[PDB]
Amino acid sequence: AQTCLTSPQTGFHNGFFYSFWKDSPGTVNFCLLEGGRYTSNWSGINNWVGGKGWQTGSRRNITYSGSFNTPGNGYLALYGWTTNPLVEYYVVDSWGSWRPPGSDGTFLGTVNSDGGTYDIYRAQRVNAPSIIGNATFYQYWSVRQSKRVGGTITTGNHFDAWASVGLNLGTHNYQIMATEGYQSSGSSDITVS
Numbered sequence: 001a002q003t004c005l006t007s008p009q010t011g012f013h014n015g016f017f018y019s020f021w022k023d024s025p026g027t028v029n030f031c032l033l034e035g036g037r038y039t040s041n042w043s044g045i046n047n048w049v050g051g052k053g054w055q056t057g058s059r060r061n062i063t064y065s066g067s068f069n070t071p072g073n074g075y076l077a078l079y080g081w082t083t084n085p086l087v088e089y090y091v092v093d094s095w096g097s098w099r100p101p102g103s104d105g106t107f108l109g110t111v112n113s114d115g116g117t118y119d120i121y122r123a124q125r126v127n128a129p130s131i132i133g134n135a136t137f138y139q140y141w142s143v144r145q146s147k148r149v150g151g152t153i154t155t156g157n158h159f160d161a162w163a164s165v166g167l168n169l170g171t172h173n174y175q176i177m178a179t180e181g182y183q184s185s186g187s188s189d190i191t192v193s
Contacts, residue, residue: 037191083171
């Protein structure tokens with residue numbers, strides 16, 4: 001069976017951790033399917049992020065396949081958090097209208113991984129939702145130079161490249177193959193590992 005949610009929550013489904021988050025505007029239909037699969041369909045939202053993965057991140061290699069589409073702002077990304085320091089990190093494989101993080105990111109270099117090349121940035125978010133409540137914190141970004149939906153993400157290559165430019169991680173919190181939407185509508189269907 002598949003279980004479809006519209007209220008933000010976390011838990012476990014078929015052995016995978018999942019996090020489904022949204023602020024109040026609009027509707028996300030976030031559905032939990034067989035194994036590592038989830039789907040999303042969003043409209044009229046301000047910001048939402050969710051997917052399947054692990055309750056505690058590591059240097060594991062993560063494989064995923066499926067589809068992602070939005071005519072507006074959204075991302076398909078390995079996504080997670082650390083604490084002390086509080087960091088929101090991203091390995092972005094695809095995006096919609098706008099390539100993140102934009103002009104507020106400090107470009108620090110590139111890393112080759114998984115047949116792609118990713119641009120590395122630090123950005124800061126001010127008073128933004130976080131796993132500890134609204135907070136000001138840094139983001140670590142790897143953003144693939146060409147878009148794709150499906151493949152492996154060798155997370156250790158990113159963590160090591162980030163470390164070599166001063167983007168050092170804290171204690172790992174959750175780690176999911178995420179779909180994110182910002183003031184947009186769209187859909188995704190992602191199967192993790």
